[PDB]
Ligand binder design. Structure first.
Ligand SMILES: [Mg+2]
Ligand SMILES: [Mg+2]
Ligand SMILES: [Mg+2]
Ligand SMILES: [Mg+2]
Ligand SMILES: [Mg+2]
Ligand SMILES: [Mg+2]
Ligand SMILES: [Mg+2]
Ligand SMILES: [Mg+2]
Ligand SMILES: [Mg+2]
Ligand SMILES: [Mg+2]
Ligand SMILES: [Mg+2]
Ligand SMILES: [Mg+2]
Ligand SMILES: [Mg+2]
Ligand SMILES: [Mg+2]
Ligand SMILES: [Mg+2]
Length: 133
RNA sequence: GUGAAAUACCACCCUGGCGCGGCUGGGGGCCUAACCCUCGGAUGGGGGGACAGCGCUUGGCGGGCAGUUUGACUGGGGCGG
């Protein structure tokens, strides 16, 4: 990685677990990218893909616009928009989509459903952050 | 573009791997100081040595011992039924 990214992860704690208002404004500083950032915030899952009775999908439209499914390995995939909308239009949206997403949990899903969440970019670094609060 | 998956900087993951560290389980070697043996002598020497022995605990072999069980009918009883 470049010094774009060498100055990047010197300013973030994957070490310290963080909350989601804490981590909402840290998204637009850590992209040293040219261009074009669509933000991706990712979560590992508490479910088993090896049974498709527990499989998940659909298409919903987020509140302010562009600007979900499980793989066979069982993690989360979806873009929430363009970098676009500023830090507190993110925190506004940051509790929005997942509380819409959680609704789809199958019954035979064993254990804590959101295993972790790292706010990141299509271009950028990893902070340990909580979907919780 | 004839394979359906796209060959970007990123994450979140799969799979084996190595690395570091955290909680760690298992082996091996040496040591002596507990513990054990010993020494005309000993607050010491020599030998064994964290084994062995002993406590609590686990599962097992276990007539060497112990307590008992080992039915009724029945032309006696058993055998047979
Ligand atoms: Mg030795
Ligand atoms: Mg000795
Ligand atoms: Mg010695
Ligand atoms: Mg001695
Ligand atoms: Mg000695
Ligand atoms: Mg012992
Ligand atoms: Mg007897
Ligand atoms: Mg017996
Ligand atoms: Mg009696
Ligand atoms: Mg009789
Ligand atoms: Mg008779
Ligand atoms: Mg008779
Ligand atoms: Mg008779
Ligand atoms: Mg008889
Ligand atoms: Mg008989």
């Amino acid at each position: 990685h470049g010094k774009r990214y060498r100055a990047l992860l010197e300013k973030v704690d994957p070490n310290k677990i963080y909350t989601i208002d804490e981590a909402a404004h840290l998204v637009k500083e850590l992209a040293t990218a040219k261009f074009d950032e669509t933000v991706e915030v990712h979560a590992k899952l508490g479910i088993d893909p090896r049974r498709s009775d527990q499989n998940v999908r659909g298409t919903v439209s987020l509140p302010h616009g562009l600007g979900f499914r499980n793989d066979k390995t069982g993690a989360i995939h979806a873009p929430v928009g363009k970098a676009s909308f500023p830090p507190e239009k993110l925190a506004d949206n940051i509790r929005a989509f997942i509380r819409a997403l959680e609704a789809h949990k199958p019954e035979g899903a064993k254990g804590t459903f959101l295993r972790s969440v790292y706010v990141t970019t299509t271009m950028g670094p990893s902070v340990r952050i909580n979907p919780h609060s």
